[PDB]
Amino acid sequence: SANNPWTGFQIFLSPYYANEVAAAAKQITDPTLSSKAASVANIPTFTWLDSVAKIPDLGTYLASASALGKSTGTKQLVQIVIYDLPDRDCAAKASNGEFSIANNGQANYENYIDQIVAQIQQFPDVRVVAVIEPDSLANLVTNLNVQKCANAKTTYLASVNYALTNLAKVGVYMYMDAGHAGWLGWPANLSPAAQLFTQVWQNAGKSPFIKGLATNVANYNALQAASPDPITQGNPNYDEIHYINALAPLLQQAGWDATFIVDQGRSGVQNIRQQWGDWCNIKGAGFGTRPTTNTGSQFIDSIVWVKPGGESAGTSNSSSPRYDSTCSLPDAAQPAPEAGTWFQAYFQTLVSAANPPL
Numbered sequence: 001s002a003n004n005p006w007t008g009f010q011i012f013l014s015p016y017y018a019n020e021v022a023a024a025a026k027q028i029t030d031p032t033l034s035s036k037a038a039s040v041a042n043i044p045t046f047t048w049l050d051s052v053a054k055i056p057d058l059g060t061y062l063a064s065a066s067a068l069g070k071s072t073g074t075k076q077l078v079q080i081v082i083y084d085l086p087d088r089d090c091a092a093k094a095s096n097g098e099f100s101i102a103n104n105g106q107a108n109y110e111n112y113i114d115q116i117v118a119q120i121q122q123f124p125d126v127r128v129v130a131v132i133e134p135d136s137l138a139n140l141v142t143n144l145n146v147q148k149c150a151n152a153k154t155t156y157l158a159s160v161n162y163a164l165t166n167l168a169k170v171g172v173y174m175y176m177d178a179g180h181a182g183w184l185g186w187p188a189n190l191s192p193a194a195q196l197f198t199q200v201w202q203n204a205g206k207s208p209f210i211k212g213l214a215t216n217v218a219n220y221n222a223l224q225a226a227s228p229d230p231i232t233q234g235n236p237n238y239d240e241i242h243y244i245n246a247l248a249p250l251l252q253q254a255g256w257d258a259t260f261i262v263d264q265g266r267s268g269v270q271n272i273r274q275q276w277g278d279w280c281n282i283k284g285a286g287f288g289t290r291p292t293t294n295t296g297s298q299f300i301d302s303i304v305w306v307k308p309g310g311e312s313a314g315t316s317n318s319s320s321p322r323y324d325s326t327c328s329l330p331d332a333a334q335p336a337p338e339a340g341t342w343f344q345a346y347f348q349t350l351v352s353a354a355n356p357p358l
């Protein structure tokens with residue numbers, strides 16, 4: 001499109017990830033690998049607003065970015081993920097997230113959005129790009145047979161609508177999460193997905209700030225695979241570029257000339273999964289293509305690193321109350337610590353296996 005949110009802006013580097021990376025790199029004993037690892041702190045990532053507790057951090061990042069821009073003559077851009085739906089991650093094998101539909105979820109989520117808007121409102125010289133609710137709307141395409149998802153459907157739609165509608169009022173550029181090629185990219189899932197995303201876009205007023213969709217968030221697919229990963233058999237859309245090429249025209253027909261961003265943060269190593277749906281701490285993953293607006297496609301505004309690599313996605317301990325058995329599969333790195341905590345060995349392999357090399 002004419003207006004790529006990233007062009008002309010300097011991406012604010014997460015200091016939280018930078019601190020995690022610095023602490024991680026000093027523990028890497030091989031000096032050559034340690035230096036490569038340290039350099040990861042210079043690669044832009046998205047900040048996940050996974051709870052209300054993260055909102056004060058957002059405020060600090062907006063204010064810091066504003067000052068860095070003035071000190072360097074640049075216009076700054078802060079990258080965030082909105083990730084706090086009630087009954088979050090409805091198809092996952094364990095509940096997570098501070099809000100529940102049964103305890104005033106809608107009002108509490110609205111207040112979470114309101115607090116985010118109240119921060120963003122104060123820093124108009126900083127641009128914000130937001131990924132809207134990973135692991136939400138895609139479940140409403142393929143997973144309505146999952147009772148928790150069926151029961152969450154109206155809340156997910158209302159809450160995502162509230163986020164889109166209110167973040168647009170402060171000029172946030174938004175990409176709704178849209179799963180990945182092995183989820184919504186199956187040819188038979190394209191049209192139901194397009195229908196859902198278009199209805200969501202319509203309900204939020206077709207705001208021009210709703211730029212399009214984010215794909216492969218927190219996943220491992222290739223953008224453009226050299227050859228199809230065996231996990232993809234049966235799906236002609238075996239990588240993200242095939243998925244995006246197939247979905248984009250369906251959105252265009254609705255009057256939404258949508259554009260896309262694609263996570264490649266953990267896509268450096270292909271052919272590492274037994275089944276396509278295996279999502280947790282996949283062993284042997286490497287950092288992938290660095291963020292860039294040189295995307296190879298009319299439809300793609302940026303390759304991005306949405307999920308920061310090194311933070312565990314779930315414990316492998318089957319005794320944890322938060323245990324999801326996906327995290328103990330033969331292709332999951334084990335032992336793995338609780339979700340959100342640093343996973344040092346996984347990070348070191350992400351660095352070692354980076355492609356292109358760090």
Ligand SMILES: *[C@@H]1O[C@H](CO)[C@@H](O)[C@H](O)[C@H]1NC(C)=O
Binds near residue numbers: 319
């Ligand atoms: C596994 O889970 C139980 C309870 O959640 C805990 O007591 C135990 O120490 C955990 N073991 C590891 C290695 O995390």
